Structures are given as structure tokens and as C-alpha cells.
Coordinates of N, CA and C in Angstrom, one line a residue:
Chain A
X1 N 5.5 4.1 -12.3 CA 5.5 2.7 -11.7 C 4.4 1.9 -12.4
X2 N 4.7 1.0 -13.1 CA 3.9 -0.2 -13.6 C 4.0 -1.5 -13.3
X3 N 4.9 -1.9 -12.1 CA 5.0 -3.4 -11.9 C 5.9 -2.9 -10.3
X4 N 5.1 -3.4 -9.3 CA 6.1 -3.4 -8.3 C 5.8 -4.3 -7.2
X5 N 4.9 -5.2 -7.4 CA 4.2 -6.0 -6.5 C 4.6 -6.4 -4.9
X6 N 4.1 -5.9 -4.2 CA 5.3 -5.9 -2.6 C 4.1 -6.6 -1.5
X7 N 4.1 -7.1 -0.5 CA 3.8 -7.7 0.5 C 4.5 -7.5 1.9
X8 N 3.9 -8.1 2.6 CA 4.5 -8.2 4.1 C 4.7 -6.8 4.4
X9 N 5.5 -6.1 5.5 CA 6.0 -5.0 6.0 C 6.7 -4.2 4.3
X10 N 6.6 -4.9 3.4 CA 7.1 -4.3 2.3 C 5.8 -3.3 1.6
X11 N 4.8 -4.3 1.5 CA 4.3 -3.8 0.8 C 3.7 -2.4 1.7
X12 N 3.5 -2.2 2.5 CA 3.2 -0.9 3.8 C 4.6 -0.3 3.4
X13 N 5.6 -0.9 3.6 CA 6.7 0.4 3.8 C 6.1 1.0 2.2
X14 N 5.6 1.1 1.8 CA 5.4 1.7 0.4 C 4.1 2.9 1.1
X15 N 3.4 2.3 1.8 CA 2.3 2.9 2.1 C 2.9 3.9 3.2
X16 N 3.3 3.4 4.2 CA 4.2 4.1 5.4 C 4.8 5.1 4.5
X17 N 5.5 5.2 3.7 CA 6.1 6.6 2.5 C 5.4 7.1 2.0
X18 N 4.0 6.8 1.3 CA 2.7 7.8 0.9 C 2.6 8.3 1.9
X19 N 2.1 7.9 3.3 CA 1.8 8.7 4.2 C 2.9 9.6 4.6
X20 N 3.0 8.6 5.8 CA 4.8 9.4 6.7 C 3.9 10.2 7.7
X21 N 2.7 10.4 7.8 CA 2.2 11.6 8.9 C 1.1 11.3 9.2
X22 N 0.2 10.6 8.3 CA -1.4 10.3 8.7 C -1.2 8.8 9.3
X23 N -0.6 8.2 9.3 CA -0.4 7.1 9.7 C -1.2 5.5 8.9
X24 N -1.5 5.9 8.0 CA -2.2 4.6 6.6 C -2.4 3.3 8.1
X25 N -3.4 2.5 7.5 CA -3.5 1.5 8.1 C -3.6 -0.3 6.8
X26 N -3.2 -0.9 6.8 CA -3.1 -1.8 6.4 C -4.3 -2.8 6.6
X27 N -5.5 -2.8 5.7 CA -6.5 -3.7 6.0 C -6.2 -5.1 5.5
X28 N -5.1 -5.6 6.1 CA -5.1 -7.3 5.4 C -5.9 -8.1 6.9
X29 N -6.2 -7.8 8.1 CA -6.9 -8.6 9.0 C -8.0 -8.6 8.4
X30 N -8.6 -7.6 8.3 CA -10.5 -7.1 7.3 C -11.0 -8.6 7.3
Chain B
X1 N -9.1 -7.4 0.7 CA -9.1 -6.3 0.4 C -7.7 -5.5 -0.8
X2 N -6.5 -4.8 -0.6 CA -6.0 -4.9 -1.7 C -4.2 -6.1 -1.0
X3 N -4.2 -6.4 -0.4 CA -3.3 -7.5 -0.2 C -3.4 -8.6 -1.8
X4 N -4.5 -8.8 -1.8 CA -4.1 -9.3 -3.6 C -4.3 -8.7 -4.4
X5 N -4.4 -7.1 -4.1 CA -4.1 -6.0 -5.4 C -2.4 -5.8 -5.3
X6 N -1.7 -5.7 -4.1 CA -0.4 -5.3 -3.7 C 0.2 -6.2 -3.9
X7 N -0.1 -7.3 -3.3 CA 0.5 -8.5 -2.8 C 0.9 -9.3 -4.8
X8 N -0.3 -9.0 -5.0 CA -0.6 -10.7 -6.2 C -0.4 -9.3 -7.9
X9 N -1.4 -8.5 -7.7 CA -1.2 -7.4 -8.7 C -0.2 -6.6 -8.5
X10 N -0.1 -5.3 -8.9 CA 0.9 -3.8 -8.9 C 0.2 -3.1 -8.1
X11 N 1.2 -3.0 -6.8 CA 1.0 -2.0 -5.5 C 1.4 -0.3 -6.3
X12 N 0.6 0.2 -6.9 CA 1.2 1.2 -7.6 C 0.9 2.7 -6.1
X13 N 2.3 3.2 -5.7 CA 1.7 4.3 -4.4 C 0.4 5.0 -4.2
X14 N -0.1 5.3 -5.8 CA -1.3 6.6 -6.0 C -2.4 5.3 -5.8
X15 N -2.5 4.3 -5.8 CA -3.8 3.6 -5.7 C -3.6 3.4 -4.1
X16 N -2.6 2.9 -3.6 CA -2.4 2.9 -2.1 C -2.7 3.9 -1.4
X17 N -2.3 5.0 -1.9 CA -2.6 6.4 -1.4 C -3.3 6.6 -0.8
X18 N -4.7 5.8 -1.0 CA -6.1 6.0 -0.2 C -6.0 5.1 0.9
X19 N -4.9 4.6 1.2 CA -4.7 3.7 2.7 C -4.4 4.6 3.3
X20 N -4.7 6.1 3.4 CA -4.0 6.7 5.0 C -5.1 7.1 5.3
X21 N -4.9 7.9 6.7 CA -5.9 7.8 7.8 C -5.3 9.0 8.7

């Protein structure tokens, strides 16, 4: 992967799939 | 935080990878 730039609930469902079990949190409020 | 690394740059998974918890 060299280019896949994602946002919104997109860019997490990417993260939501690294995890799947720890449950990742999305710091864009921060 | 990385919302303009994901969002604006390459959300690449292994650099995201350090978003779980």
C-alpha cells in the first residue's frame, strides 16, 4: 500500500480491520 | 492528529496500526 487516502467512517473501517478485537479509537475530536 | 495523515496523506494500515487500544 502506497496511496489510499480514506476519511470519515472509511478511513477507521481500515483501522476497525487492523484491530477487529482491541477496539482502535479514532483521535480526530483530540 | 493523523486525520491529515489519513484523511489528506496515505492512511497506510501498519502506521494506523498504533490506533488500537
Amino acid at each position: 500500500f502506497v496511496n489510499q487516502h480514506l476519511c470519515g467512517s472509511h478511513l477507521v473501517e481500515a483501522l476497525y480491520l487492523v484491530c477487529x478485537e482491541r477496539x482502535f479509537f479514532y483521535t480526530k475530536p483530540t | 492528529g493523523i486525520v491529515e495523515q489519513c484523511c489528506t496523506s496515505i492512511c497506510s494500515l501498519y502506521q494506523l496500526e498504533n490506533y488500537c487500544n
